[PDB]
Design a binder for this molecule. Structure first.
Ligand SMILES: [Ca+2]
Lengths: 221, 56
């Protein structure tokens, strides 16, 4: 998160860290046994870390749980990045500092806003990964401006959020993290052109289009 | 020769550690890969990297 602020210990209870010997992606707890993240975060040997603030030191409120299953959307396209969503089943249920986030009943409109969080890079030009969780409030942008920023790359399953001036954005290490609006999970950190660059807002997976797929998939696995 | 190409992070935001052959240093180094649109000079281990690009 570039241009954000320190959230504060466990103030974002649904935020999880995907660990493969080091933090590589974020995710959101949507059930005591299920986590939602990005399809491009798929990796074997994933350990999910819950109740984390400082990802580098054990503070006592954590729960490290291995994933038993990782279901990437059947229509995920690694080239166009369309359908960049994945579900991870925890080997055992988490003890709900730790809480799930609600799935949306409806899609959010431009102007809404949202809270984006993660442990990704905090510098636009350079590298600086934080210890604690960073937060950012950014508004959802209109489909047209999003499409103007990334010609022929935006599908109906993606939405832009951020600022055209630049300086505030998600960045490497934030992928799979939550974009929560009005207490509902509206997006998943996905891609962008660089970080916090002018006229290049971040792109996110539009969660409202997958709610029925998510509910049915959780229930039959 | 893809072994001589600079490492490509890509547009995705993950922070996945991969290897690339660094022709100048004559060895495989680590770099951060974003999770999508990988080019060929991108390996999961130093061993794969050396076997494919070693000495190029
Ligand atoms: Ca910790």
């Amino acid at each position: 998160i570039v241009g954000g602020y320190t959230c504060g210990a466990n103030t974002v209870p649904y935020q999880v860290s995907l660990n493969s010997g080091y933090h590589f992606c974020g995710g959101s707890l949507i059930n005591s046994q299920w986590v939602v993240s990005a399809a491009h975060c798929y990796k074997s040997g994933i350990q999910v870390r819950l109740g984390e603030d400082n990802i580098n030191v054990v503070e006592g409120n954590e729960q490290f749980i291995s994933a038993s299953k990782s279901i990437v959307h059947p229509s995920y396209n690694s080239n166009t990045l369309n359908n960049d969503i994945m579900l991870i089943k925890l080997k055992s249920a988490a003890s709900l500092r730790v809480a799930s986030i609600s799935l949306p009943t409806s899609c959010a409109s431009a102007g809404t806003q949202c809270l984006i969080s993660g442990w990704g890079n905090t510098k636009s030009s350079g590298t600086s990964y934080p210890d604690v969780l960073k937060c950012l409030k950014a508004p959802i942008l209109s489909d047209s401006s999003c499409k103007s920023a990334y010609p022929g790359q935006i599908t109906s399953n993606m939405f832009c959020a951020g600022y055209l001036e630049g300086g505030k954005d998600s960045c490497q290490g934030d992928s799979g993290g939550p974009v929560v609006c009005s207490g509902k999970l509206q997006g998943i950190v996905s891609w962008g052109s660089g970080c916090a660059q002018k006229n290049k807002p971040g792109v996110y997976t539009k969660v409202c289009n997958y709610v029925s797929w998510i509910k049915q998939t959780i229930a039959s696995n | 020769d893809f072994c001589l190409e600079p490492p490509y992070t890509g547009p995705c935001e993950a922070r996945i550690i991969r290897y690339f052959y660094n022709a100048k240093a004559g060895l495989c180094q680590t770099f951060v890969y974003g999770g999508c649109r990988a080019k060929r000079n991108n390996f999961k281990s130093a061993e794969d990297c050396l076997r494919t690009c070693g000495g190029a």
